[PDB]
What does this fold into?
Amino acid sequence: PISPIETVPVKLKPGMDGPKVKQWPLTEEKIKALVEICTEMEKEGKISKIGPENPYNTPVFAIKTKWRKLVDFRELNKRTQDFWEVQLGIPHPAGLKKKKSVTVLDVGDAYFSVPLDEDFRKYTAFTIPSINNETPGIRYQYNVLPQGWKGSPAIFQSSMTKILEPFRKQNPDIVIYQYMDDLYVGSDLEIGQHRTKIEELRQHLLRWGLTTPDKKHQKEPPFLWMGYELHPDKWTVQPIVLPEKDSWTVNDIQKLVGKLNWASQIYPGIKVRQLCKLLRGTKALTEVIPLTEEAELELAENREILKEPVHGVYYDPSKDLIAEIQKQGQGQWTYQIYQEPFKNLKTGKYARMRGAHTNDVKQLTEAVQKITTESIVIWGKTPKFKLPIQKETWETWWTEYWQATWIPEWEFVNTPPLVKLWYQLEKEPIVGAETFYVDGAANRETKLGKAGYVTNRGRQKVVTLTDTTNQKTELQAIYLALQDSGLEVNIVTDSQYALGIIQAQPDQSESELVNQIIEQLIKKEKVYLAWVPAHKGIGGNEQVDKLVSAGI
Amino acid sequence: IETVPVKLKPGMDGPKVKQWPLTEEKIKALVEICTEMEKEGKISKIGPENPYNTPVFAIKSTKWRKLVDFRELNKRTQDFWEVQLGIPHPAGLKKKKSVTVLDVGDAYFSVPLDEDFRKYTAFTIPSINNETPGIRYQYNVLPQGWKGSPAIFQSSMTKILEPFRKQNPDIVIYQYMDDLYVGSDLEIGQHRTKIEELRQHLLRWGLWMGYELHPDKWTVQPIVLPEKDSWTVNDIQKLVGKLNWASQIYPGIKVRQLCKLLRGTKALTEVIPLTEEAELELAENREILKEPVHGVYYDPSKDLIAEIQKQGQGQWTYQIYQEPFKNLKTGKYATNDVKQLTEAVQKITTESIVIWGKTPKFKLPIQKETWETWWTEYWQATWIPEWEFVNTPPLVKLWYQ
Ligand SMILES: Cc1cc(C#N)cc(Oc2ccc(Cc3n[nH]c4nnccc34)cc2Br)c1
It folds into this structure.
């Protein structure tokens, strides 16, 4: 058929005229096949012959079984307007509510069953050439949404939306899911009444030009859809086969990572940190990458988790979501969402470094936030969290930290490792504690560092780095004061850079120097850190800068 | 009543801003509103031949309200609502004893929107788990939240207000977005009595903070130099840092007499006496910081920007400027971080409106996604200021108490 639904108006881009693309002389087999195909199409209202007055053309090609008509709509697509995004997201099985009866309905020739805007049809012109282009070709133009046209997906959706609306109003019980050609219907009413409800829908669809499967042709659960398996009261990913290989290429490791990431929607504890590290440093697609011991370790542990199948449950609106997060590995986190203890609706993981330096409390918040968005998207609400961190620990951090941070309802859960602040800078300077005035120069051109310090206990020391930025030396100088110092210490710098970095209480860094400074900071009993303006002539900062500056 | 023709310019296409996920309660709240508004003919559904989108949200009392985020559209309409059809800002408003804000957003619903301009008002109501493609709409009347609405509506606004203005010529009235800012120097009772009068006038045609604003009792938050019985080396260093950085804003700040103190390589904990010229330099800096910044003036062609620091214990500090650290205004604010942060934004934005007739671009100390998830939960304004997200330099936090 072709829906009676009024066509959606369709402009070209404001400055643009329609395509005048030359038809390439095609071969007889092809020229024949097109004629043949265009006949049957024409006689069903899909296309219509036209005069020589219409100046527009788009290439047509034919390809093998079978013969297919391919229109090269590239130039028209450039010239037609932008449409609104079809969808913001794809549904997630975990969001799907449980229903007694559920039917899948795919629309037949979905695009060709929808009319094109009369005023636009002229632009969809294309010509079947005559043999050796000796004579005027046969000229056609679409009355319906063409395959490969920019606007087909949007217009179709719109059409199907408009069409379903009244049914939705007349049947606010029935859950209808819209996705591409398909239409997924579900209800709690009994297997008799459903099959009638399905039929009056199929009818309503037929009344608006939309063919649909007979009950002998409707599929049965499990539904294999978009990577998942949707069973009558559970869901899962489709089978995952982690290849057994001697030598792994870059290509093999990418596909492995990709499969594991897919796996991690319902399979807890999946990890990819070490497999990922391999991929860095643009190697060749087919280049073999020896597995590290940590990669090999990681793969092994992923295989354990996957060995026995895991399934997920469907959503029940009459219950709260509960989100649980576990730390596992520096950088890596893993979470599970359920409503009844350990019957997971879904599962996931979070790695992600926000910046160069961070700590677990910061990472835990970041992961809670990611999970909060996810839930709102999937279930339209946020879950109750259960976190491996003390209220008292969290309290200490957020209040003293300069960023605004916040997380909704949550409870502590003792599921080690536990997130803890590994050190705490003092709030006041420390009596009976040597004040190290640190400083760090670096000659811009020569790169020769001169990181050192002076102290109130008399001590004075300067070293020499090589190939270091001024950041690096000012930061090396602090590691210097942390190395040569006791279990208490006041450190004075004129580098805000280092100050900010350290006041964030990092427990993890992309820098090497910083991880060494963290090591020290953890071991000390009391560190206090202060800042001053350089070159304003400060007692201590001037003394250090002297020995530190010697060398252009 | 027929429509004022509108435009963007030949350049700049319309807004294509994505729709931020909403919770079920709001999605539902928004369909009730959007059904009522379509029956009433204010908005109407739309096909996907409209490529434009503006975000929409639901906010608050027990009743919900639809907030549409026309921030991109305003940016792309600036020629229309500012230069062509602008509303002047009275410099007297800030001088008044009391300012009351009134919501005149309903006014805009009884005025049709240029049919050629309606495609640029598209918004989507999103659907949980992407069940449905979600309900697309666009406006037929003037929308609330768009800056063009008051621009267009001002001619009709003048009429409504004329009698009130004539009868009370010492009362100043400014229109911003969906709001009337109405200020007087009357006593609080008489002021309120006059506001209720203005309500009746409006009635005949169609219609943080804490009740009413009181602009004349707004004052700078000076950079606070402690007095201190006893001063340690640290305390001086801290004091020098403030004064070294204040000198980059305030003509005449001096720090020399204080360096005199910090000698060579002292322990931070060591107490040190308070010299005479240092004592004076201190007090003379204090007096400077009471006053506003000499040399800095509001340029209506530049954007205003606001920085806010979390001072802990429910304390927030903030500064408004156009050129970095050249402050037109500094201030303070005082149950959770985001809730308070959003209150402070609203407050500061109100002041910004009363004082310069526009809102500042905020530099908010919070992770993008936390703010985007939660800002609407406690938001009460009809407008939305422009924000970016920034890590606070820990020093600046220190320098403003
Ligand atoms: C996104 C999408 C794709 C496909 C396919 N193919 C089908 C869909 O519909 C659904 C799938 C699962 C469920 C749970 C469910 N409840 N009761 C059931 N009985 N059999 C199978 C699934 C379910 C509900 C709907 Br309604 C949704």
Remarks:
- Chain B touches chain A through 69 residues (CB under 8 Å).
- The pocket of PZ2 is lined by residues A 91, 96, 98-99, 102, 104, 175, 177, 179, 184, 186, 221, 223, 225, 230, 232, 314 (CB under 6 Å).
